[PDB]
Point group: C3
Chain length 280, copies 3
Amino acid sequence: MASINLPFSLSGSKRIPTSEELADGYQCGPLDVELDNWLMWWLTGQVDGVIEGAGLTTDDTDLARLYKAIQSMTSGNLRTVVLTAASGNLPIPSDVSVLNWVRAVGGGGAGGNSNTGNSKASGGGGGAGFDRFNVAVTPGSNVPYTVGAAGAVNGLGAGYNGGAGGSTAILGTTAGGGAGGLGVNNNATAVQVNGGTTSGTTPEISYPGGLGTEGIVGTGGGSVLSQPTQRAFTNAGNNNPANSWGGGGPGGSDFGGAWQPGGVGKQGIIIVQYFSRFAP
Amino acid sequence: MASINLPFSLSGSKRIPTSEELADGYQCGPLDVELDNWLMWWLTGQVDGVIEGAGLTTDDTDLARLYKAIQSMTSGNLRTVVLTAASGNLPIPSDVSVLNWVRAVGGGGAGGNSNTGNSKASGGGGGAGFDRFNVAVTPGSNVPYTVGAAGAVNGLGAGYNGGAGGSTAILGTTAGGGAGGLGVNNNATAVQVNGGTTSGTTPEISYPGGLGTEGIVGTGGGSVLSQPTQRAFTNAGNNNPANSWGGGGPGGSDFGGAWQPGGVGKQGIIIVQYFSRFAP
Amino acid sequence: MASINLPFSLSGSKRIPTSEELADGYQCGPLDVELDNWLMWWLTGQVDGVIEGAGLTTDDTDLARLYKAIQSMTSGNLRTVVLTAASGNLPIPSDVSVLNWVRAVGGGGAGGNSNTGNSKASGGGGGAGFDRFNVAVTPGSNVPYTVGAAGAVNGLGAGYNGGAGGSTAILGTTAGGGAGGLGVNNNATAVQVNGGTTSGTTPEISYPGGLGTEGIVGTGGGSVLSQPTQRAFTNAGNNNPANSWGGGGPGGSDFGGAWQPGGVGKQGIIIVQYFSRFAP
């Protein structure tokens, strides 16, 4: 039989080793069951606690138990979580006390709208990202996370600035989403659109999102996961979106009497990691 | 007196303890070494199993063994293996049961070719990439790994498409490589080609490769580790290559009769991390 | 009475059991104090060392100590130290022998200066980076870390080479810094400037810094942390800097007879993680 459930004494009139029991091991008097009972129960109960603390069973014959289940504790049980819903409640398992390598990225911003003239429109900036380590969390439920929504594009026509991306926040740290691009009419160069920032509790490392350009190059800023995206000279509004999460669309271009609606900025995501024995 | 080799019983007439001896302590009657032999053999076997799990010699007087080799089990014994050969196998040591943070990058293609005209060529695409955390791996010999090839250059002459990029695959997940840039004649600008693509089993986090340009800006799309690289305005064919793994070619410009084949993208790599007491 | 001064014997006439005593269990002879002292002392002292080396206090009846305080050794006590001082020493705690994922990035270089003319100045290179995992050090003091100084803009006048940023180096590995931009006069544009490179003890992974353009594109230097930054087309010389550490100035700009000095090169930083009960 594998399972043993082995705290030995289990409330058997136990007794801590007194000062004389610590200056030297035992005494010339009789060896009482009371003290040896604790001297066995404490050791075996902590052994059992380590074994079963990683969702394992204490086998009497294995004698290894995944190297005291430490391999399951350290190497295994690493259950990463990626968050994509607009807003929800992140569950905390019972035994989890620390979240490690929490990464967040603000949503990027869509680019500007360009008409059939001569000058080009601007691309939206990229959202910001940060990493925090050794994040203390309480058992139960985590603070409801919020993510940065994808950069909305106003397809009502050319010359209308793109919508800015949403700002994500979790564990008391807010990642400002990238600002949307600026749409201008002919013979007009838009302004260099600033990207997102990090606000709130200072992260260990912060990545300010790439900021959008005027429109001569028209590249959308990236993020931790996203890279700059370049414009595409097309006459059918192919409007290739941001490459990855947090990036900003390249925006509209201007060539051959065609109007580009503008690039699309991808939303932001939340990454949290923790070692638990339960269902992630 | 460092090495002790201390499992106590080692076939010394062991026995499973009774249910009552787990409910209550030792019976007050005559002692039974048949029981205490197993009771102490189990504990010492667990402890020296922890000691050997990190490849440390069990000691009697040290009483720490670097926190029972746990300090060398979590912080130490961290092995990083960089796979670069296009064909090979990953030797998984015996004491490895789960592989975590399997960083993989695909190789990016090279840029196109432009003749002695006015219009430039498309920059090479970038290879995709992904990260998988806590991958289940059985001890022994792993399924052979495949890393992508570098960005081939069709150095035959101008006006020809660049070489395609090589894809990488490992553990049932494939990170496709970025297609090479298109070759162009004079008085015509290239059309951008998409970058790397994620395929196979769904990774926990994927980094799509930065795609190329039509040619006017002519940046070489980056990757997980590589950032975009612009072209070079030199008539000597300097055409500097991508910065790092997964990058693409900046492409060949077209000014003053320049025969620029463009840059050459390097190949992707696979980075894994596991915990072992053997050599990396 | 939480803490106990827990290791049981403490000079209580300990004698190691013989090899014959290790081959079998308890012998038919009478109970000897010198065996039952050591054979409990080693187990209980190993457990006490594990508990007290994790920064947790021994308890009598807790029976868990937060699962042997291993969570304080796997996830807890995960200490992150980022260095942003210009120069100085990096202290190593008394129990720290290995640092996890030592991350460094080279300093960035600002771009060149542009006068009032059709041509634009060239940008500055970006610092290089490298990650070293499972680096071995000694408890005590470490080599004085040398971060790269931020690349200051060269405001000496029109067409002057930009200021270069320092290179970073720590623990036998030196990452090249981002060279400054090249300053040229109107009706003329310089050539690309190379970025930093990884030198010293070749790490597991190296991030070569993003190099600037000839000047037509004028993108900022890139790095693993800092994204390339574009130039500002403004009449007041807004000189947008690099977003994060290691980036480079996008170089001097000009349109319609403007004088823009160009962006400023950001500095390099050092990131390390180690495990220790001592707060950083």
